[PDB]
Structures are given as structure tokens and as C-alpha cells.
Amino acid sequence: SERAAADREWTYGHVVVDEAQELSEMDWRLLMRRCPRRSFTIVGDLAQRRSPAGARSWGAMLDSYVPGRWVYKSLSVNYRTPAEIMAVAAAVLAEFAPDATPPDSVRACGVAP
Amino acid sequence: NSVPGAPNRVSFAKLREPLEVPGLLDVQTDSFEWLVGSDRWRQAAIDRGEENPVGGLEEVLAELSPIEDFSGSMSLSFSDPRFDEVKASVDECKDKDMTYAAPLFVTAEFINNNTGEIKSQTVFMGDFPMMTEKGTFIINGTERVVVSQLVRSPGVYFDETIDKSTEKTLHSVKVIPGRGAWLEFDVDKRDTVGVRIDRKRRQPVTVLLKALGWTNEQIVERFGFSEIMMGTLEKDTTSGTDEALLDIYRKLRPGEPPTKESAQTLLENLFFKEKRYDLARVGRYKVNKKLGLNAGKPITSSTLTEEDVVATIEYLVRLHEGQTSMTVPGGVEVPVEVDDIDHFGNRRLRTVGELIQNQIRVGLSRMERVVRERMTTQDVEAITPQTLINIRPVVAAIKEFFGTSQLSQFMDQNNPLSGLTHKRRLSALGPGGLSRERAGLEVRDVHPSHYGRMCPIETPEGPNIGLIGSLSVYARVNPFGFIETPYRKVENGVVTDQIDYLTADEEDRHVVAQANSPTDENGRFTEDRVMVRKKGGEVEFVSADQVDYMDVSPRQMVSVATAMIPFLEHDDANRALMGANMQRQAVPLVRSEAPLVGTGMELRAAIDAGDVVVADKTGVIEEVSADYITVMADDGTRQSYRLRKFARSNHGTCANQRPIVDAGQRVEAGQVIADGPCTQNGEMALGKNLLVAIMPWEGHNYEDAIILSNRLVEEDVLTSIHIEEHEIDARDTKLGAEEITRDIPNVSDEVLADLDERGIVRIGAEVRDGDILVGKVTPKEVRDTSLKVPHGESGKVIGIRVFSREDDDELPAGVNELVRVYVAQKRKISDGDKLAGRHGNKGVIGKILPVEDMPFLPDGTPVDIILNTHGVPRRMNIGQILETHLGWVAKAGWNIDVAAGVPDWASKLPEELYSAPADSTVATPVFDGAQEGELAGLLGSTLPNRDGEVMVDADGKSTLFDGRSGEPFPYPVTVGYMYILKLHHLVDDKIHARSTGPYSMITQQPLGGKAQFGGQRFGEMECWAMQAYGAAYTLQELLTIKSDDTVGRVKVYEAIVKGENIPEPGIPESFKVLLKELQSLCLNVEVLS
Structure with missing residues (x-):
């Protein structure tokens, strides 16, 4: 850790990125300058972006470095959060170019908000 | 036995040898045969080998021929080498300082495509030195040995490693040929693959791939499973095949005018053209089996390719990525691993033949350049080979390999075994291997691939430990130069009698068992968990069904000088090393005596060395004299063997042969007819058996010192003859002639009495330091520069060897005469001389005692050597105790009383070993020999003495008497017979002293050495030690009046001779030049007071 953090030309072996939707194209550029082995564990969401730079698309950030090779998987069902709050925040999200992809929440057995 | 005149030597061996000891210089004769393409090797190869057996000369020429020119018009070709009989013989070559050589001829054909004409001639290529049946060469008289070489085989080698800075595990690849340039690849600390074409700047790897005509589509179909290689592609500013070839011709030929065709002809005529890059059949085979290529194919095409330069990268990349399995696109599966x-x-082993092949190749390349130089400057159809060909270069190469190399060594003959281990030697140094940059600590170690191929013990003690070694006794050499050792094929658990000579690569694939493993009914094992080795030497116990091979014998992994150490499994390894390397440097004795307790490997080591004489043909003996022997065979042909008498070895020892046969003796073939310097009846006898008592004496055997009787001096037991050679040359000086005469300048005529007419010394006379040997006068009118005896030397003048120019025999540039005088000295054992046994037990001789004050036995027998108790257990060499015991058991015979059956300690003994007379001889093979049950109860038997009294009990001990006091030592002492060796480390060769003499006139100190008559180094640590005492005057004295001060040593000599107070430098003296030159620099200096 101390050898690496003190160096910029350091080639890592793996790179984990949480809340990935908040990195500018130059951030991904620097990263891929760090990991040539292109072993990534990117996690994120596009509808919950805060930065304006952001990505808005993984292909925009990756096809420049890993074209057609990058795998993509999306979790489908929702179980942790009730479906009441989910409909609340899904019709909240139903604004500003929603194209809403609400994951189907289940097992809500309590008092509504 | 299996040898005609084999003196019986009973053996405790309990195992049978399904394979006899192969020849012991068949590694220095098979290769020369190969080279000269003798018919013996031809047959041997046609049996198991190709149907077109090419030699080593044939191959060289075939690669040379045909010599075409740029115009493809006129061609030259060589073929059909042919050797005519030797001009002289070995003995003549030595007597005359000639060389043992045979003329070599070659058929040269000269074709012209214009006219279709041929001008064949049988041209002469010079005299070629020959390998004597003893495995030697003879060069200007001296026997010389061309020692084999250990070298990295050609091929591809992948080496992981760690980055000094990043401490990052990275990888690499290196392709090394037998001839040409190297080709490396790397995966860098930044995950960028790259290449190092001809060890130049590290440019990327896709550059190469493109320079061979690859499109990114191909680079991405072949690769693409990886993502560091694509990332390397992406960062190739030099996109474009021709831009890449420009990059390469630039990095290689930087700046100078480029060209595309030049580019292709460089990228081709550096790797793919089989005249500037060659992977000999071994490199091709290694590459093929490594990468998974060309399985079961005709290896004929021995050069690089474009498919392998790609499979190499692919292997590398699946290596960095932890992939264990590879499959070239069309090849066969393969393991991915480091090498x-x-x-x-x-x-692999470069044998003598390969070395000489290479140097002949050099000479021929030069002769070819000359051929060309001389072919396009002489009218066509009028030039003939004899005009195109100048052999003078080739001979030089030959005359430069033997005369001056590192693998061509003066023969190491202190004794037969010293020369026989100089030939089965494996040296990791010399041009072609590691020279100085890799004399580290991981190459000098033992590796489980040494089992049966290189001895883990025999390696000299000096600076070449782990570099030089000795080949084992059951080992031979593949044609590819890899070393092979035999094993026995197991099929279901039952040891087959079938042999297989495997090499390390093959061995690592199976489970190789051990020789001592038991067998009950035609082979099957008795146990269930038998012990074996494995790939990485990983000894393990395993079920006897998992087994696939087996060792023919123990003593497989040991050498000659180490299979002649009895009870070796009882001695640790450093002292066994000592024992071997001291058994090499043992001086021959006048009368030789062979060991009572020994090993079975002492008959062959003398037959297979060559100092013995053996019968070429069966027959009877017609005449026997000291010098000549004359045999009449059954075929009627009469043979005549001349014997060496008091000839000087290359180390001062004697080389006297002596007959052991009587007229009218029906000898067989291979039967010993004469014994050599250290043999008796045909088996190595390097020392003598002595009566030893293991006990401390009155301080005179303290700290590995040891004691002797004066008997060993009266009877000339440990006496040895040493001969010395002194030469003087009467060469030109331009002031006249260096003349050798008796009318010496004015000197005592009494010095001119032992000189013959010609001013040379008279045979039979005795000399002493200073005494004249040959009067040589170099003109001035005349001075005196004669050959006088050196310091610390004397002896009888044996004989003389003169070489004149009035015969024109041969003499070097500017010489008219040479005189060689030999002088002999009988040297007896003395206080200081080193002495040893085969177990690393060594010491110097502190006291020589009269026999009347030596511990004696109740029968009156005084022991001959006393050895102390304290050195045995901390040095871990008790094999000598066992040797002592068995020596007793053999000098006093034995009779096991079987009247009531065979004792339980003898239920494993070979019958014919239930009895023996006195002075018997036995054999304890290193790892199959005398045990401790077979040796405990075998000490009780011990037939009594002439008076019926048993002088040694069942524990190995007697009861001695103080020859001084008279009383018996109050405790029983361990007595027996031990085989003891006298060594070249003698004190007449080490005592050095100096008061005055010659200096170096460069550093202006005395010279360093003993022949130089020099002084002793007083170093820095010694000056520290001299300061810590607070001694200032000794230091001043030593640093000024003895070495450097040239105006003080004279004052001192004069003072002393006059008896006046030895002076003192009034003001230091090394200071004055520095004083001047600092004053000269305008820096005032004032010596104060």
C-alpha cells in the first residue's frame, strides 16, 4: 500500500470502483492507465448520478478502452426495500427523461409511509 | 573378477550387478571417433542411429561447402576426409617433443557453371592431433587433456524473477542458439510486453510481429485472450510493416542509410537464414518438445521459424497469467511452466570432439574468406583449389586450442587416479559457459538431476567448488550431449533385467527406486512401502505398484575416487570430499602395497587408466626384462611392450613400470603384464597398511598431529622418488653465439669436475644448491650465465636430453641448442610431511619415534602409527575405525565356527566368506558391504598368532605396553590396520625464508613467492594487530627498512655486518617527494621541531 500510494505509474492487479457513475472520462482514463490488465469490478447506478460529468452510458467510458469485451450484468428484482417506497420513488423518478426501469419489489408487510 | 589375472579380493556384497562398470575413458574416445568418423562409431550409430551417419568433420565441411560467389558462377566443395598413418609414436613424440598427429586430406571439387568443368584434387589440410588410447593428446611432448564442458543447451528458457524496486513478480523469455544472436522477451513491471532483439533497446513486441508480415486482425485472433498484449499493440506509434522494419534496422544500424530490401534481408539474414543463425539438432528438439511443435518429424530443418517466435510469446503470456496448459494452433498440448x-x-556436455569441431569451423570460415578474396582476383578456369586454398589459418586454430586454452590442460598425473579423474571431469568454465559474471552460489550447489550424472562429492577444494565436478561411473553421453544414466525397468512390481539409459528430462517423469530394495522371487519386492525419488528429488515412501524404474546398483551416483572409499555411508560428506581430493594428490612410493580392506573399484580404475600394461593377445611370455617384455601369441605374432622406467611425470612424481610375470606364462587377453607407479598385481595401491592404535600419547599427537615409528624410515615404507627437470637454451643474442662449453670464466676447477667434455654435467653425479649443471657462455668478451642448482634442491643426475640445431630436428625462433637435465631425490617421511587416509583423516607428523619407545603388543609387535581419539567424533569419519577393525580381521584371518550352525550375525554372509587366511584381502563396496553384525562377531574369530595368543578381543581392542616406562596402559586400546596415504604436501616444498635478495623495481618491495625467493605479506589487519599492542618501532621497521626504503636497507645490512647500533630515520622519508610537489604548487610547508 505504501509503495503504491506513493507512486502514479503503478500497475495494479485489480480495481474496484463503487458508485462508478461519478467519474469523469479522464478519471477512467487515469484508472486504465493504472490497470492495463483490465480487471475491474465496477459497481454503480446511472439514475442516481450526482456529478454532471458522469457517464450516462458505460459504453461511452469503456468502448474506448475495452470495446465489445466488457461484460455487463444488471440485478433485476428488488427485495430489500418495500414496494410502497419503491412506487413512491419510481413515480418521483418518473420525470426528467425517466425511461423508468423499476426493479419489482416484493414482500412489503408493514405500514405505508 | 572377470579379469584374467585378477588377484582374489573377497567381497561382503549381498547384491548382484546386472550391469558391469562401463569403460572409464569411453567419454574421451567415443567423441574423437565421432569427430574423425571412424568405422567403429559408424557401426555403433548404424545400429541405433540414422542410416546416414555423419561425423564431425563431414558435418563442418557440408555446412561450409559449396563455396559459391556473388555471381553464382564458380563453386568450390569439399568432401571425403581421410587420415593417413601417424608419422611417429607416442613414445617418440615425447622423446622428441613432437606432436601426435596424422595428415588429413580432403577432396576439393571446383565447378564452373559457365563451362561445366571440374578440377577435383585431393588437397592437404595439415596435420591433425590424435586422441591416444589412454584418452590423451600429445602436444610438443606433454600429455594434455581436453576436459569436457557443461553449458546451457540451445533453446528457449523462461525465467520468472522479482523487480529489485517494485518487488513485483514478473516474467521473461530468452532464446539462445548454438550459433547466432539471442532473442529475448519480457513482461515489464508496467504490464507492457516487449522484445530485446539482439540484446538492444527494449522496443515493443508487436513491432516484430508486424516486421514478419502480420495484420492487427492476426495479432488479435492469435492473441486477444490477453489484455496487456492488446494494450501493447495500442501504443505502437510505428504502425506499418515497413515502418517497423525501419525501426528495427534503425535500432540495429542507427542513422546509416536504410532500405526496405535491406530491412527484409536483415530481419531474415539474422534469424531465418541458416548461416548467420543455427539451432543445432538439440536446440530444434528442445524447442519442439517444449512448445508443442513438429511432433514426430524429420528434424532435418535446424533453424528458427516464424511459428515458434509466436508460440514463444504465447507461452510467455499464458505464463504471466498463470495458465498451466497451452496448445499452439495445430501443435500438441504442453505444460506451461518455468525452466x-x-x-x-x-x-549439456561439449565433449572434446565438439570443441575441436568448433575451432576447425573458425579456421575454415577464415580459409573461406581467403578463398573468396582469392577467387575473384585470378583468371577463371586457370584457378585451381590448391591455388584458392591456404591452410595456414586452420592449423593455427588447432595450434591455438591445445597450445593455449583453458579446457586443454596439462595432464594431472600425481598418480593414475589423478589422471583418470582429469578425464571424467565436467567443467563449468571456459569460453561458452559462465566465465566470471555468474560464479555465484546457486550454480555451485547440488541438484537432484546429479544422481547418476555428476558426483555430489568429488569437486576440488579450491575456488572451483561446484563449477568443476567428475562424471559418475555408470554414466554416458547422448549424441545431443546430454548425460545419461541407466535404470532397470519395473513392469508390475517385478524388477525386469532390461536396461534403459535415461536422461534427467525422462527420469523426472517416473518413480525411480533404489538398488537395495528387496526382492524375493525373480524380482518382486518383499515390502509394501518402498522408498523412491520423484521429480524434484522428493524422496518418498510409496506403494511398490507405483514404481516404474529402478537403479542398477548403488555407487551409481559416486565417481571413481569416491567408490574407492570404504565405509563411505559411515563418513560425513565434507570429510569424504577431503578423502577423495587427497587420494588424488598421493605421491607414488618405491614399493607399492595394496589395501587389505578395500573396495571392488580398484582393479578397473587401474586397467581403465592406462599405467598398467595388458596383453593385447593371448599367448605365452617369451622374454621378460626390466625394460622390454616379449610375448609369442597363439597366432604366432610376436608382441613387444616397452616399459617406462624412472620417467618424470608432469608433477615431479616417478613413472616406473615393473613386470609381474615369469617366462613361460600362459597369459590371456587383457591380463596385466606390468604394474605401474601405484598398482600391485593390477589394482590401485596409493598407500600402505600400517598398524594403528587409536589413543592419545604424550602430547605429540595434539590437534590432528600424528606419530610414526622409525621403521617406516628404516624399511623405506613411505619413501618416494621425486624427479626434477631443468632446461637451458643457447639462443642468439646478436653479439655472437650463446655457447655451451667447459672453459667457463675464471672459477674453481673443482666445480668443473662433474662436467663432461661439452661442459654438461655427468650422469650419476650428485648435486647441491649452486652446483653447476651445464656451462653456458653468452658473449659479452665472455660472461658466465650457467645453469646452477636452485635453492633447496639436490639429487642424482639421472640422464640428459639435448636438442641441437646441427641436426635441425626443431627449435624455436632464434635458438641453437637446448639442454634438459633430470635430477632425482629419494624423499623419506619426515617431521612435517602430510599424511592421510581415505576418510578425510589427515595430519602432519609431529614425532618420529624409535621402535623401542612405541606402544607394543604382548607378542612384541610395535605399532607403526598413533592416531588420537579426540578428532574422530567431532569430525564424523568413523569409517576409519571400521577400516581398522577389518584390517585386523584381514591381516589375521578368521574361521567362523559353523559346527553348531551359522551364527545369526552371519545369516546374510556370502559363503566363501566363512573363513580366510592371514594377509587376506577383502572388499567392502561403498553402500553394499561390511555391516556391524557381520563385523562384530567377525572380530572374535580372528585366528590366533603364531603362539596361540589372541592379541585383540571381540571389541577391537588389545592391551599395550608403554615402551618407555614398561607398564601396560591400564585400559584396553583399539588396534588394527589402516590404509594410509602420503601426499604431495611436503615440507621440503614449503619451507621458505629470506633475509635479502631481489626486488620488484615497480612497487620496489621484495617479490612475492617462493621460486621468486620473496618475502611474506605484512598486511593491514596485521598492522592493526601490531598497533593494538602499542608497538610503533616494529611497524616503522617493517614498512620502511624492509620493503620500500631503498636507502635504509643498505644502511641496515652494513650496520648489522659491522655490529653497530641499527640506525633510525632521523626524519620520516616517504614525505620528501610529496613535500617537494606541494611546495612546487606554491604552498609553504615547514617541517617543525
Whole structure:
């Protein structure tokens, strides 16, 4: 850790990125300058972006470095959060170019908000 | 036995040898045969080998021929080498300082395509030195040995490593040919693959791939499973085949005018053209089996390719990525792994024949350049080979390999075994291997691929430990130069009698068992968990059904000088090393005596060395004299063997042969007819058996010192003859002639009495330091520069060897005469002389005692050597105790009383070993020999003495008497017979002293050495030690009046001779030049007071 953090030309072996939707194209550029082995564990969401730079698309950030090779998987069902709050925040999200992809929440057995 | 005149030597061996000891210089004769393409090797190869057996000369020429020119018009070709009989013989070559050589001829054909004409001639290529049946060469008189070489085989080698800075595990690849340039690849600390074409700047790897005509589509179909290689592609500013070839011709030929065709002809005529890059059949085979290529194919095409330069990268990349399995697109599956570098499936043996092949190749390349120089400057159809060909270069190469190399060594003959281990030697140094940059600590170690191929023990003690070694006794050499050792094929658990000579690569694939493993009914094992080795030497116990091979014998992994150490499994390894390397440097004795307790490997080591004489043909003996022997065979042909008498070895020892046969003796073939310097009846006798008592004496055997009787001096037991050679040359000086005469300048005529007419010394006379040997006068009118005896030397003048120019025999540039005088000295054992046994037990001789004050036995027998108790257990060499015991058991015979059956300690003994007379001889093979049950109860038997009294009990001990006091030592002492060796480390050769003499006139100190008559180094640590005492005057004295001060040593000599107070430098003296030159620099200096 101390050898690496003190160096910029350091080639890592793996790179984990949480809340990935908040990195500018130059951030991904620097990263891929760090990991040539292109072993990534990117996690994120596009509808919950805060930065304006952001990505808005993984292909925009990756096809420049890993074209057609990058795998993509999306979790489908929702179980942790009730479906009441989910409909609340899904019709909240139903604004500003929603194209809403609400994951189907289940097992809500309590008092509504 | 299996030898005609084999003196019986009973053996405790309980195992049978399904394979006899192969020849012991068949590694220095098979290769020369190969080279000269003798018919013996031809047959041997046609049996198991190709149907077109090419030699080593044939191959060289075939690669040379045909010599075409740029115009493809006129061609030259060589073929049909042919050797005519030797001009002289070995003995003549030595007597005359000639060389043992045979003329070599070659058929040269000269074709012209214009006219279709031929001008064949049988041209002469010079005299070629020959390998004597003893495995030697003879050069200007001296026997010389061309020692084999251990070298990295050609091929591809991948080596992981760690980055000094990043401490990052990275990888690499290196392609090394037998001839040409190297080709490396790397995966860098930044995950960028790259290449190092001809060890130049590290440019990327896709550059190459493109320079061979690859499109990114191909680079991405072949690769693409990886993402560091694509990332390397992406960062190739030099996109474009021709831009890449420009990059390469630039990095190689930087700046100078380029060209595309030049580019292709460089990228081709550096790797793919089989005249500037060659992977000999071994490199091709290694590459093929490594990468998964060309399985079961005709290896004929021995050069690089474009498919392998790609499979190499692919292997590398699946290596960095942890992939264990590879499959070239069309090849066969393969294991992905790193390649060890000390392993012997990768190391290979350059034998003498290969070395001489290479130097002949050099000479021929030069002769070819000359042929060309001389072919396009002489009218066509009028030039003939004899005009195109100048052999003078080739001979030089030959005359430069033997005369001056590192693998061509003066023969190491202190004794037969010293020369026989100089030939089965394996040297990791010399041009072609590691020279100085890799004399580290991981190549000098033992590797489990040494089992049966290189001895783990026999390696000299000096600076070449782990570099030089000795080949084992059951080992031979593949044609590819890899070393092979035999094993026995197991099929279901039952040891077959079938042999297989495996090499390390093959061995690592199976489970190789051990020789002592038991067998009950035609082979099957008795146990269930038998012990074996494995790939990485990983000894393990395993079920006897998992087994696939087996060792023919123990003593497989040991050498000659180490299979002649009895009870070796009872001695640790450093002292066994000592024992071997001291058994090499043992001086021959006047009368030789062979060991009572010995090993079975002492008959062959003398037959297979060559100092014995053996019968070429069966027959009877017609005449026997000291010098000549004359045999009449059954075929009627009469043979005549001349014997060496008091000839000087290359180390001062004697080389006297002596007959052991009587007229009218029906000898067989291979039967010993004469014994050599250290043999008796045909088996190595390097020392003598002595009566030893293991006990401390009155301080005179303290700290590894030891005691002797004066008997060993009266009877000339440890006496040895040493001969010395002194030469003087009467060469030109331009002031007249260096003349050798008796009318010496004015000197005592009494010095001119032992000189013959010609001013040379008279045979039979005795000399002493200073005494004249040959009067040589160099003109001035005349001075005196004669040959006088050196310091610390004397002896009888044996004989003389003169070489004149009035015969024109041969003499070097500017000489008219040479005189060689030999002088002999009988040297007796003395206080200081080193002495040893085969177990690393060594010491100097502190006291020589009269026999009347030596511990004696109740029968009156005084012991001959006293050895102390304290050195045995901390040095871990008790094999000598066992040797002592068995020596007793053999000098006093034995009779096991079987009246009531065979004792239980003898239920494993070979019958014919239930009895023996006195002075018997036995054999304890290193790892199959005398045990301790077979040796405990075998000490009780011990037939009584002439008076019926048993002088040694069942524990190995007697009861001695103080020859001084008279009383018996109050405790029983361990007595027996031990085989003891006298060594070249003698004190007449080490005592050095100096008061005055010659200096170096460069550093202006005395010279360093003993022949130089020099002084002793007083160093820095010694000056520290001299300061810590507070001694200032000794230091001043030593640093000024003895070495450097040249105006003080004279004052001192004069003072002393006059008896006046030895002076003192009034003001230091090394200071004055520095004083001047600092004053000269305008820096005032004032010596104060």
C-alpha cells in the first residue's frame, strides 16, 4: 500500500470502483492507465448520478478502452426495500427523461409511509 | 573378477550387478571417433542411429561447402576426409617433443557453371592431433587433456524473477542458439510486453510481429485472450510493416542509410537464414518438445521459424497469467511452466570432439574468406583449389586450442587416479559457459538431476567448488550431449533385467527406486512401502505398484575416487570430499602395497587408466626384462611392450613400470603384464597398511598431529622418488653465439669436475644448491650465465636430453641448442610431511619415534602409527575405525565356527566368506558391504598368532605396553590396520625464508613467492594487530627498512655486518617527494621541531 500510494505509474492487479457513475472520462482514463490488465469490478447506478460529468452510458467510458469485451450484468428484482417506497420513488423518478426501469419489489408487510 | 589375472579380493556384497562398470575413458574416445568418423562409431550409430551417419568433420565441411560467389558462377566443395598413418609414436613424440598427429586430406571439387568443368584434387589440410588410447593428446611432448564442458543447451528458457524496486513478480523469455544472436522477451513491471532483439533497446513486441508480415486482425485472433498484449499493440506509434522494419534496422544500424530490401534481408539474414543463425539438432528438439511443435518429424530443418517466435510469446503470456496448459494452433498440448537452469536436461556436455569441431569451423570460415578474396582476383578456369586454398589459418586454430586454452590442460598425473579423474571431469568454465559474471552460489550447489550424472562429492577444494565436478561411473553421453544414466525397468512390481539409459528430462517423469530394495522371487519386492525419488528429488515412501524404474546398483551416483572409499555411508560428506581430493594428490612410493580392506573399484580404475600394461593377445611370455617384455601369441605374432622406467611425470612424481610375470606364462587377453607407479598385481595401491592404535600419547599427537615409528624410515615404507627437470637454451643474442662449453670464466676447477667434455654435467653425479649443471657462455668478451642448482634442491643426475640445431630436428625462433637435465631425490617421511587416509583423516607428523619407545603388543609387535581419539567424533569419519577393525580381521584371518550352525550375525554372509587366511584381502563396496553384525562377531574369530595368543578381543581392542616406562596402559586400546596415504604436501616444498635478495623495481618491495625467493605479506589487519599492542618501532621497521626504503636497507645490512647500533630515520622519508610537489604548487610547508 505504501509503495503504491506513493507512486502514479503503478500497475495494479485489480480495481474496484463503487458508485462508478461519478467519474469523469479522464478519471477512467487515469484508472486504465493504472490497470492495463483490465480487471475491474465496477459497481454503480446511472439514475442516481450526482456529478454532471458522469457517464450516462458505460459504453461511452469503456468502448474506448475495452470495446465489445466488457461484460455487463444488471440485478433485476428488488427485495430489500418495500414496494410502497419503491412506487413512491419510481413515480418521483418518473420525470426528467425517466425511461423508468423499476426493479419489482416484493414482500412489503408493514405500514405505508 | 572377470579379469584374467585378477588377484582374489573377497567381497561382503549381498547384491548382484546386472550391469558391469562401463569403460572409464569411453567419454574421451567415443567423441574423437565421432569427430574423425571412424568405422567403429559408424557401426555403433548404424545400429541405433540414422542410416546416414555423419561425423564431425563431414558435418563442418557440408555446412561450409559449396563455396559459391556473388555471381553464382564458380563453386568450390569439399568432401571425403581421410587420415593417413601417424608419422611417429607416442613414445617418440615425447622423446622428441613432437606432436601426435596424422595428415588429413580432403577432396576439393571446383565447378564452373559457365563451362561445366571440374578440377577435383585431393588437397592437404595439415596435420591433425590424435586422441591416444589412454584418452590423451600429445602436444610438443606433454600429455594434455581436453576436459569436457557443461553449458546451457540451445533453446528457449523462461525465467520468472522479482523487480529489485517494485518487488513485483514478473516474467521473461530468452532464446539462445548454438550459433547466432539471442532473442529475448519480457513482461515489464508496467504490464507492457516487449522484445530485446539482439540484446538492444527494449522496443515493443508487436513491432516484430508486424516486421514478419502480420495484420492487427492476426495479432488479435492469435492473441486477444490477453489484455496487456492488446494494450501493447495500442501504443505502437510505428504502425506499418515497413515502418517497423525501419525501426528495427534503425535500432540495429542507427542513422546509416536504410532500405526496405535491406530491412527484409536483415530481419531474415539474422534469424531465418541458416548461416548467420543455427539451432543445432538439440536446440530444434528442445524447442519442439517444449512448445508443442513438429511432433514426430524429420528434424532435418535446424533453424528458427516464424511459428515458434509466436508460440514463444504465447507461452510467455499464458505464463504471466498463470495458465498451466497451452496448445499452439495445430501443435500438441504442453505444460506451461518455468525452466530451471542448473537442471541437466537443459545443461549439456561439449565433449572434446565438439570443441575441436568448433575451432576447425573458425579456421575454415577464415580459409573461406581467403578463398573468396582469392577467387575473384585470378583468371577463371586457370584457378585451381590448391591455388584458392591456404591452410595456414586452420592449423593455427588447432595450434591455438591445445597450445593455449583453458579446457586443454596439462595432464594431472600425481598418480593414475589423478589422471583418470582429469578425464571424467565436467567443467563449468571456459569460453561458452559462465566465465566470471555468474560464479555465484546457486550454480555451485547440488541438484537432484546429479544422481547418476555428476558426483555430489568429488569437486576440488579450491575456488572451483561446484563449477568443476567428475562424471559418475555408470554414466554416458547422448549424441545431443546430454548425460545419461541407466535404470532397470519395473513392469508390475517385478524388477525386469532390461536396461534403459535415461536422461534427467525422462527420469523426472517416473518413480525411480533404489538398488537395495528387496526382492524375493525373480524380482518382486518383499515390502509394501518402498522408498523412491520423484521429480524434484522428493524422496518418498510409496506403494511398490507405483514404481516404474529402478537403479542398477548403488555407487551409481559416486565417481571413481569416491567408490574407492570404504565405509563411505559411515563418513560425513565434507570429510569424504577431503578423502577423495587427497587420494588424488598421493605421491607414488618405491614399493607399492595394496589395501587389505578395500573396495571392488580398484582393479578397473587401474586397467581403465592406462599405467598398467595388458596383453593385447593371448599367448605365452617369451622374454621378460626390466625394460622390454616379449610375448609369442597363439597366432604366432610376436608382441613387444616397452616399459617406462624412472620417467618424470608432469608433477615431479616417478613413472616406473615393473613386470609381474615369469617366462613361460600362459597369459590371456587383457591380463596385466606390468604394474605401474601405484598398482600391485593390477589394482590401485596409493598407500600402505600400517598398524594403528587409536589413543592419545604424550602430547605429540595434539590437534590432528600424528606419530610414526622409525621403521617406516628404516624399511623405506613411505619413501618416494621425486624427479626434477631443468632446461637451458643457447639462443642468439646478436653479439655472437650463446655457447655451451667447459672453459667457463675464471672459477674453481673443482666445480668443473662433474662436467663432461661439452661442459654438461655427468650422469650419476650428485648435486647441491649452486652446483653447476651445464656451462653456458653468452658473449659479452665472455660472461658466465650457467645453469646452477636452485635453492633447496639436490639429487642424482639421472640422464640428459639435448636438442641441437646441427641436426635441425626443431627449435624455436632464434635458438641453437637446448639442454634438459633430470635430477632425482629419494624423499623419506619426515617431521612435517602430510599424511592421510581415505576418510578425510589427515595430519602432519609431529614425532618420529624409535621402535623401542612405541606402544607394543604382548607378542612384541610395535605399532607403526598413533592416531588420537579426540578428532574422530567431532569430525564424523568413523569409517576409519571400521577400516581398522577389518584390517585386523584381514591381516589375521578368521574361521567362523559353523559346527553348531551359522551364527545369526552371519545369516546374510556370502559363503566363501566363512573363513580366510592371514594377509587376506577383502572388499567392502561403498553402500553394499561390511555391516556391524557381520563385523562384530567377525572380530572374535580372528585366528590366533603364531603362539596361540589372541592379541585383540571381540571389541577391537588389545592391551599395550608403554615402551618407555614398561607398564601396560591400564585400559584396553583399539588396534588394527589402516590404509594410509602420503601426499604431495611436503615440507621440503614449503619451507621458505629470506633475509635479502631481489626486488620488484615497480612497487620496489621484495617479490612475492617462493621460486621468486620473496618475502611474506605484512598486511593491514596485521598492522592493526601490531598497533593494538602499542608497538610503533616494529611497524616503522617493517614498512620502511624492509620493503620500500631503498636507502635504509643498505644502511641496515652494513650496520648489522659491522655490529653497530641499527640506525633510525632521523626524519620520516616517504614525505620528501610529496613535500617537494606541494611546495612546487606554491604552498609553504615547514617541517617543525
